[PDB]
Ligand binder design. Structure first.
Ligand SMILES: *[C@@H]1O[C@H](CO)[C@@H](O)[C@H](O)[C@H]1NC(C)=O
Ligand SMILES: *[C@@H]1O[C@H](CO)[C@@H](O)[C@H](O)[C@H]1NC(C)=O
Ligand SMILES: *[C@@H]1O[C@H](CO)[C@@H](O)[C@H](O)[C@H]1NC(C)=O
Ligand SMILES: *[C@@H]1O[C@H](CO)[C@@H](O)[C@H](O)[C@H]1NC(C)=O
Lengths: 298, 50, 272, 49
């Protein structure tokens, strides 16, 4: 009230709220180890117009090996801060690797322009992943200039995100198509890079890998080295079921889930349940002591 | 009866408005806190608050 | 084998009576009215019906929009698998789904799918009734998937349902089994369709083609081209479209009603 | 090399992009389609052999 005198009556002031006692962890089980050596230590990389893709699921992820191996600069992330990657389980992992020149690296961003963005590789605008590239001259550049690395220059329209075009046919820039005679007024859409180890930093071959993620909704498939914890009930605690954190009280249920169901969502679409992903039992998840306090004085 | 109905309807509007991006990345406060650096998280939380 | 001796007729059509509700998520909800946008079966449609019981063997190359409600007013497990491709001539990968008596083959291969994968043998004349013939293809190259599953032993009652997610990475199938009866040939009613599998084939999928048994025994004389028996079955196939639906969940947690906000002004009024 | 000032006009190449006697129309950056759909400033044409 901001005073030293109060009148007869009853005045509401602050609020009370029990605090949780502990946190628990309840994951499915354990996996193995992710094949980052296979992805980062390939003999040669694919060319951009035929970029590659690899799937990752069912292995234990890590970051310190990437920091242990060769200097991997230009390590930039969208929708994640790289450090906390280890402290979050993600399903749907994919890794796309290829090689370009040192310049068009600036073009790898969600929403861009340029030959690569339009005709070789497009990222979705809501791309929620992370890009990693590095120069590689002792590997790709040869004295005569490596010409095994090609790219596409011509196309009627730009690509949609995560698409590739391996079709090879003469582009007809002007009208009156020359129809496979490869004469002038017609272009071979593909060209090749010259990688003499003399061009300079603006033309060195750079190895690029992009790791794409997908929001955690479907049961997860990759995780980190955090251990599950024993289960306790009937106490306002901090739970984490399979990356689903919260704080409140859990109870054994009366409900009946179909084998494909997992939680309680209510009218406001908020959780009161988990099926124990070790014992497969339905628990109803509900907040604890809430309230606001009133004081009576004469 | 009308009085009772009108009041409840308005309250439901407030309850449902909790779930709306309001021009941000997530509706769950804990999820905005997660997968985001303090600086960026702060400005995303700021959006939700307004 | 060029199996001929089959007649040409226009396709069968019939009406879709609200038979197609796929639970779209794992959320155990109940006693609620969760409105939700989702590609689905537009209620009431003069949709097609390849009618294959002369001998009426209708099995043409059917394209893929986005998923197929696939009913079998039948008796005896003839319809088995399907292909799923854009050229099907080993020049590209294709999906292949085969359903034998024992395991499923989801071979994503550059395979020249030539002729029909028919199950002729049917040694019922020799008291065996074992059918076997593999004209599902000719060759199998660069196949990146195959799933030997749990080994099992293989009126009208096999009304199947098979929503097939064009979106790759997760080829989920929404389905139900139904003991159907009387020769209503397409019943009215309302039934659920839980999602089933999840396959990162990642291919451009384009055209399925049903794989089926043929009954070949003493009562089936003649060279392969005509030497078989038909057996009674019929199947209905429907495509989907993107709509917005309103679902009504009982206390037991079961989807029990729905409303398509896109059919009539009366409906839309409800939907608001 | 003569350097002719071109200004206060419209740069119609309708009888240019479609003419047969062209052999070396080497345009760099500007696609020869949107020659009309992009603008420029004071023009200066090097005319010579
Ligand atoms: C539905 O009936 C119409 C009207 O007779 C007919 O023309 C059409 O072939 C049927 N099916 C389709 C494709 O709408
Ligand atoms: C696929 O098989 C063909 C035929 O043997 C072969 O030439 C080609 O290299 C194979 N491709 C891959 C990616 O294995
Ligand atoms: C799928 O196949 C069709 C037919 O060949 C083709 O037009 C389409 O571009 C393909 N999809 C993609 C993503 O290329
Ligand atoms: C739901 O479950 C209860 C309890 O088993 C059962 O009595 C009832 O028949 C079921 N169906 C409905 C619609 O209540």
């Amino acid at each position: 009230l901001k005073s030293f005198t109060v009148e007869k009556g009853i005045y509401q002031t602050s609020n009370f709220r029990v605090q949780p006692t502990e946190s628990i962890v309840r994951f499915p089980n354990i996996t193995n180890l992710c094949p980052f050596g296979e992805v980062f230590n390939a003999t040669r990389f694919a060319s951009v117009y035929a970029w590659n893709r690899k799937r990752i699921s069912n292995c234990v992820a890590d970051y310190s090996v990437l920091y242990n191996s060769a200097s991997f600069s230009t390590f930039k992330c969208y929708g994640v801060s790289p450090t906390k990657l280890n402290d979050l389980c993600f399903t749907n992992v994919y890794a796309d690797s290829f090689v370009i020149r040192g310049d068009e690296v600036r073009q790898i961003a969600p929403g861009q322009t340029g030959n690569i963005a339009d005709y070789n590789y497009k990222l979705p605008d809501d791309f929620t992943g992370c890009v990693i590239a590095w120069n590689s001259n002792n590997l790709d550049s040869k004295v005569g200039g490596n010409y095994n690395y090609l790219y596409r220059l011509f196309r009627k329209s730009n690509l949609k995100p995560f698409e590739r075009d391996i079709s090879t046919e003469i582009y007809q820039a002007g009208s009156t198509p020359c129809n496979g005679v490869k004469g002038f007024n017609c272009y071979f859409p593909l060209q090749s890079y010259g990688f003499q180890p003399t061009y300079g930093v603006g033309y060195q071959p750079y190895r690029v890998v992009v790791l794409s993620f997908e929001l955690l909704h479907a049961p997860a498939t990759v995780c980190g080295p955090k251990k599950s914890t024993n289960l306790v009930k009937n106490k306002c605690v901090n739970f984490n079921f399979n990356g689903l954190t919260g704080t409140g009280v859990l109870t054994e249920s009366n409900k009946k889930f179909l084998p494909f169901q997992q939680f309680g969502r209510d009218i406001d679409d908020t959780t009161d349940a988990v099926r124990d992903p070790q014992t497969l039992e339905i628990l109803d998840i509900t907040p604890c002591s809430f309230g606001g306090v009133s004081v009576i004085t004469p | 009866q009308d009085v009772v109905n009108q009041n409840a309807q308005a309250l439901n509007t407030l309850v449902k408005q909790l779930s709306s991006n309001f021009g941000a990345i997530s509706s769950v406060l804990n999820d905005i806190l997660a997968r985001l650096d303090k600086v960026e998280a702060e400005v995303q939380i700021d959006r939700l608050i307004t | 084998v060029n199996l001929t001796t089959r007649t040409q007729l226009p396709p069968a059509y019939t009406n879709s009576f609200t038979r197609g509700v796929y639970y779209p998520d794992k959320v155990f909800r109940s006693s609620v009215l969760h409105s939700t946008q989702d590609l689905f079966l537009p209620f009431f449609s003069n949709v097609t019906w390849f009618h294959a019981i002369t001998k009426r063997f209708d099995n043409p190359v059917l394209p893929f929009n986005d998923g197929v409600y696939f009913a079998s007013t039948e008796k005896s497990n003839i319809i088995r698998g399907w292909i799923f491709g854009t050229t099907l001539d080993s020049k590209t990968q294709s999906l292949l789904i085969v359903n034998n008596a024992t395991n499923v083959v989801i071979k994503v291969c550059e395979f020249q799918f030539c002729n029909d994968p028919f199950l002729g043998v049917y040694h019922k004349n020799n008291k065996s009734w074992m059918e076997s013939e593999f004209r599902v293809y000719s060759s199998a190259n660069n196949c990146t998937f195959e799933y030997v599953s749990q080994p099992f032993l293989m009126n009208f009652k096999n009304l199947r349902e098979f929503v097939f997610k064009n979106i790759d990475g997760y080829f989920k199938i929404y389905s139900k089994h139904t003991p159907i009866n009387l020769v209503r040939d397409l019943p009215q009613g309302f039934s659920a369709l839980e999602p089933l599998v999840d396959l990162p084939i990642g291919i451009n999928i384009t055209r399925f083609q049903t794989l089926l048994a043929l009954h070949r025994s003493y009562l089936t004389p003649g060279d392969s081209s005509s030497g078989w028996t038909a057996g009674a079955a019929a199947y209905y196939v429907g495509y989907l479209q993107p709509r917005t639906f309103l679902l009504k969940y009982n206390e037991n947690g079961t989807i029990t009603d729905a409303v398509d906000c896109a059919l009539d002004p009366l409906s839309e009024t409800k939907c608001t």
